[PDB]
Amino acid sequence: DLADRFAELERRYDARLGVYVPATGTTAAIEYRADERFAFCSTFKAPLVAAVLHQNPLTHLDKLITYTSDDIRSISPVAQQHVQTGMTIGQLCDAAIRYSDGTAANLLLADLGGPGGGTAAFTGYLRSLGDTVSRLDAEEPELNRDPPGDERDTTTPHAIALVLQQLVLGNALPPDKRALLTDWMARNTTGAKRIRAGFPADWKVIDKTGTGDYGRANDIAVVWSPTGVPYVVAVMSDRAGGGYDAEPREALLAEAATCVAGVLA
């Protein structure tokens, strides 16, 4: 059945695969290695934006943040362009989600504040959503680099799916902040070959990707059927057998998502 198909994918890509889809009214949870830890990688940037939105009035989005050359320490497609003028919190949220901008994420962590450059407050935000599993310990670029099996900077497919469910479908955020988060994920530019690739075109998909060392490739999404029925989909993977420089393999996530879509159709 579905477990056999996911195991086939692990052998095909020399990978470890984790999948979680929470249960709904009529569908049982889909779970494969769903309680094993995988690195967040950039998937943490979605709940990070939620944390910053929740913490501040909505007009905080218009506050200008300045930064300089020594702040660009990671893949930062937007922040590298605006370094000469600064970026507002809103622009930083946009870039962190839609371009997985690492400098934007680091600046948003600092905006959250507190110990660990904001990582402790980020973890505390997850705890307030009932997530007792996930932990963020470093910022960019280091959070992509922990050795396989190390629990620093990890979540699980199960844990991050339940967090995303509350943020997008539940009441963790007031409606106006919920809509900002949802719209940024809906306009993501980095996810076309992951969960989006597994679902038919008449399904709506919003997502946040993650990519890291040891062949790490993640995607977390909310999808809506053509009749508006929502599902949360978390897919996580690594290829530790190839070492630090193992290539991430997006097609693994597209195939896993195709399997999931077949069950939810």
Residue numbers in the entry: 29 to 293
Sentences from the paper on this structure:
BlaC is a class A β-lactamase and due to its broad substrate specificity towards β-lactams, β-lactam antibiotics alone are not an efficacious treatment course for TB infections. BlaC, a hydrolase (EC 3.5.2.6), cleaves lactam carbon–nitrogen amide bonds rapidly, effectively deactivating β-lactam antibiotics. As previously reported for BlaC and other class A serine β-lactamases such as TEM-1, SHV-1, and the CTXMs, the global fold consists of two domains, the α-domain and the α/β-domain. Located in the α-domain, adjacent to the α/β-domain, are the catalytic residues Ser-70, Lys-73 and Glu-166 (numbered according to Ambler notation).
